[PDB]
Design an enzyme around this catalytic site. Structure first.
Site, PDB file in Angstrom:
ATOM      1  NE  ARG A  19      -5.222   0.990  -1.691  1.00  0.00           N
ATOM      2  CZ  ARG A  19      -4.002   1.372  -1.404  1.00  0.00           C
ATOM      3  NH1 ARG A  19      -3.002   1.134  -2.240  1.00  0.00           N
ATOM      4  NH2 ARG A  19      -3.783   2.032  -0.266  1.00  0.00           N
ATOM      5  CG  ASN A  37      -5.835   3.585  -4.494  1.00  0.00           C
ATOM      6  OD1 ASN A  37      -5.320   4.156  -3.482  1.00  0.00           O
ATOM      7  ND2 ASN A  37      -6.981   2.974  -4.423  1.00  0.00           N
TER       8      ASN A  37
HETATM    9 CL   LIG Z   1      -7.181   1.709   0.793  1.00  0.00          CL
END
Ligand SMILES: [Cl-]
Ligand SMILES: [Cl-]
Ligand SMILES: [K+]
Ligand SMILES: [K+]
Lengths: 90, 90
Positions: A19, A37
């Protein structure tokens, strides 16, 4: 042209900086949107901007950061929603 | 850095000029390798070259030519073999 890509990314993709690295790459490219996520182990993202820059980020997302091992990506193309900045949202 | 991506591409990906368009984009970007149709209706490709160029082509491959509808791309990163030029094999 301006496009919006909605991705699901599968493999060894959580706990490896996916991310944060995606966000760094989006900001370099000028791509707006978000990443998060999912509870099944996958990563979900929205990438919005110029087609060349969005495609560059999609391709990057097949590699990921050094310890990511991506096995597949799914893209759904969408109408732009005016994303501003690139955010980690989950 | 030089990388090699091996793709399997699924969706409405045959009978839409996908191989010809991929070849065109590969030659524009300077990516080496090949593409072919498989009998199950999927497209297989090998993309080899500078990582930024390969990534741009992978990103393109989720859009495809106008009538293409790409539902997923499976990816395996491989050791580069020394591909030169891009061609259609099957
Ligand atoms: Cl991450
Ligand atoms: Cl074709
Ligand atoms: K990686
Ligand atoms: K298309």
């Amino acid at each position: 042209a301006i496009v919006r890509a909605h991705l699901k990314i599968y493999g060894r993709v959580q706990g490896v900086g996916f991310r944060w690295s995606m966000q760094r790459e989006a900001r370099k490219l000028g791509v707006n949107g978000w990443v998060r996520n999912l509870p099944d182990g996958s990563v979900e993202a929205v990438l919005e901007g110029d087609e060349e820059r969005v495609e560059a980020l999609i391709g990057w997302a097949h590699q990921g950061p050094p310890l990511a091992r991506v096995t597949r990506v799914e893209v759904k193309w969408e109408q732009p929603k005016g994303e501003k900045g690139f955010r980690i949202v989950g």
